[PDB]
Symmetry: C3
Subunit: 397 residues, 3 copies
């Protein structure tokens, strides 16, 4: 059971739940219905457990990528907003919340990687990657460096690789093509090669992770870094006079960073579908709804569309939205588990000298068609595990 009447909501700890409950109070003054906002620990792991048994929250707030696997299990119900409501949110944020063609959640907040620069050492950030080598030699002569960001992660290095033409899976007609992997193409090729060049030319260090790079920017040792909204707090406390802006273009093409849309999904087994429907649409996805959640903990950029235009006064946020629009939306499929492991090695192999661009990229393509496609076969290890649970609980109890 999931209690017919009260709307129980599950949101992550680090989000503005008090600002959400503040909205949940204005709901119960209107149609009377009591709202309980719980923030359970490891809820992205508890939800797939209790929801399967027909329990859990009415509404779940989490990053869209994880909703795919939920929608695969039939844990989420198809939402029903009209063409009128669908337009007061950003067109692209609707592609983030679709599975098999059905819409399975409402978009809330967008999050993308942005260029972060020290105004003191560089009052005018570079619009092209091409000029970064030349810029470094200008700064090295003064002891500083041009750019420092996490090279160990594909999430950070992908924007450059993807820039010219690289992509995870082809998204066309509101659906994902798992037999169309663009990690090997001419765009990803020249992309990685350029990164590899900036490494052997001695402009970036192959061993740089997240800690080394953030510390360097928060020390004033580097003029630029690539990072998202989460880092902004630390950069305040170090008191570095910094600005956030659009990502540098490569070959005359904008960098395409991955998009992280926070979304609200309705439980399939919830009996209060028309109440959640009323909750999220009429109230939360208006200025007054979001403004309440924002004041508790900032959401960054938002899907509505009236309200972000108001927030867009802060350049930092307007820079997140602008990067989010030019980027590709992080695919919500189980084959995305693969792509990550394929590219993480490909970027690390190529950057160290172990393999070449051509080689390490073409190797990754085979490794994707290995991982998540065989890991798919290891799903039957749980199907055939039920034989274990059956052979004990049908025989006896």
């Amino acid at each position: 059971k999931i209690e017919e009447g009260k709307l129980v909501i599950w949101i992550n700890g680090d989000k503005g739940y008090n600002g959400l409950a503040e909205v949940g109070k204005k709901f119960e003054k209107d149609t009377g219905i009591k709202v309980t906002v719980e923030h359970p620990d490891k809820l992205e792991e508890k939800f797939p457990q209790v929801a399967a048994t027909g329990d859990g929250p009415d509404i779940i707030f989490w990053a869209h990528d994880r909703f795919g696997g939920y929608a695969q299990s039939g844990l989420l119900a198809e939402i029903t907003p009209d063409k009128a409501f669908q337009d007061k949110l950003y067109p692209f944020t609707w592609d983030a919340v679709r599975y098999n063609g059905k819409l399975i959640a409402y978009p809330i907040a967008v999050e993308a990687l942005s260029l972060i620069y020290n105004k003191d050492l560089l009052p005018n950030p570079p619009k092209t990657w091409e000029e970064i080598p030349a810029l470094d030699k200008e700064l090295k002569a003064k002891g500083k460096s041009a750019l420092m960001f996490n090279l160990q992660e594909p999430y950070f290095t992908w924007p450059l690789i993807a820039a010219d033409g690289g992509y995870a899976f082809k998204y066309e007609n509101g659906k994902y093509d798992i037999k169309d992997v663009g990690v090997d193409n001419a765009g990803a090729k020249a992309g990685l090669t350029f990164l590899v060049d900036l490494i052997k030319n001695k402009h970036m260090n192959a061993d740089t992770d997240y800690s080394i790079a953030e510390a360097a920017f928060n020390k004033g040792e580097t003029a630029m870094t690539i990072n998202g909204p989460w880092a902004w707090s630390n950069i305040d406390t170090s008191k570095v006079n910094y600005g956030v802006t659009v990502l540098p273009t490569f070959k005359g093409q904008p960098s395409k960073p991955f998009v992280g849309v926070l979304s609200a999904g309705i439980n399939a087994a919830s009996p209060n579908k028309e109440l959640a429907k009323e909750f999220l649409e009429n109230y939360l996805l208006t200025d007054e709804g979001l403004e309440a959640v924002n004041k508790d903990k900032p959401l960054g950029a938002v899907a509505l569309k009236s309200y972000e235009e108001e927030l867009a006064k802060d350049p930092r946020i307007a820079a997140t939205m602008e990067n989010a629009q030019k980027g590709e939306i992080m695919p919500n499929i189980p084959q995305m588990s693969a792509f990550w492991y394929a590219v993480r090695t490909a970027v690390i192999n190529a950057a160290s000298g172990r393999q070449t661009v051509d080689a390490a990229l073409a190797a990754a393509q085979t490794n994707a068609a290995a991982m998540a496609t065989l890991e798919k076969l290891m799903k039957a290890f749980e199907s055939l595990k039920s034989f274990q649970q059956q052979q004990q609980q049908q025989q006896q109890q």
Copy 2:
């Protein structure tokens, strides 16, 4: 060495073989060629073992589903009956004996699930599933159950789940689509939802297996049950006044049971292809042939139109055919094995409460895909080893 100049036929022991031999005796008089009718134990296991080597019978009689794997291993030869003789049989039976878009056997007899009811407790059977909630409460007043059938098996529950639009695999233009599974669509969902509700409204028991149901019906405790023609014999002994009829409809759609067509196939190694074709086309699949087999032991509903309109005079046989023309033919492909296991769990989990209708059905489609490609793994490791196991050890943290 099948001795070029004779026909040796394999048919199961329970089946009316003495009748087949009579038609083999008739065949002999006319052509001068001796026909043998043999019934070895587990012939459906022995056949592919000897047919492979180029040994065994010229004609093997068995349920069409098993012919899927035979056709695969090329043990069966393509039949070439002209269009004239095709219209002699029912259209939907020709879809049962078709592999890779090719005809690989002759249809003989149709077996399908039906609604069997106690004429005394219920002189008029419901024509809708939706009515069974009401009908139970009326009979629970006289100390009787309305409906009791095997709920442990998908074979029995499927007629209700498929009724709204669910399907095993998609069949169009003589071909099955192994990527088009209709287990989790809109139809199957509301189907299982109804079957689940009848349980949580206490109209049925989640624990009811085959035995319980047949015992509950045979002693006169329950009014109705779902079962095939194999069960009639026992009900006679129990002297309960029963009748067989078409399954109840759900949302104005007929129930879709599985159809097991008994068929005769010609061996690919057989040197007497033309004599077999002469025997099955001109002597067995006629009024005079099938009547003789049926006179030994009943075939039930037959694929031949002229003789079916004669057996249908018994209400029970006409009901099985009625239910058949409304059912989906059981797929003879190997992916069918996966379908069973996935659905068997799905129904059991939904019927116990473990998982919801929406989740259990979606998860069965991930099971049907995973278990099906994992069967290739077992079969590759098996047939690679016979050319000269788990391989498990998959290994992260990366969150901080």
Copy 3:
């Protein structure tokens, strides 16, 4: 790290590397560029190990089939010959060197099976396969046989299986179809029936391999054998008066044996790509280039038209070329590994009577799919999980060692 300003060519020791070196030092006097021709052991397995790390030769010479796996790993750079140069070579040789719809190597030599016969025992060799029954019992009267070739290996028996319609995969519009197999079709069926009928009519023996076949023709016991140009050296030794010709036809259709094209690709990591394209186009792939390679160790049938029409004076070489033009180019895809193993059992099980024609070829079409995919799986993880654990062991020494 491949050494800029100079060339380094790899070719197998068995081939005319000294002939190639002559063309090497020809290119020197004319452009002032040092061309080193090395011939190292198991180079066909060493190349993907050094080219992966961005090292090795500039040009590699090997049979095209192995390039598919090289092109997969991206080790070979796309070649750009214009349509003017392309027409110098036979059209079919361009299909042997194509991956993902891209040309990745320059075709040098062509290799195929041919019908070899004894002109003493049999002056006029049979045109069709169907007349080999009638011919066998004639020679059996003298105390000889008509034909004996290696039945153990599909590479040998395939010309007959494929003759009526069978194919490995469907090559159309510059790419192969891994889901279109022609192993159990009505052509392959009748093909293999005929081979088996010859076995159970006692015209051939099911236990015959390469050694049996070669030694039996080399001692004049059999009138015919099917073998390629590599065998010729041994038949020149045996002093047997022998002829090479086009393969017999089956049901009016010519036998389609497999084609092996020796070809030269350019390394992806090579900095001298326009020099490699200079040496291979203007110097080597001309008759004066191939005249020198051929003089060292004969290449057999050459891809270049002009020089081919000169070598065809040898009736043996002329026949080898004809059988290639009738043949299908051996698919360079990784699924090919399976095809062999599937068809290897099919032919052996069909010859031994352990299975019928129909039954044996139908297992091959299932085995080929079952192996290739589920073997291609395993190989991915072996070469991933063994390099995943190798990763943390470095980290253990970056702080300890």
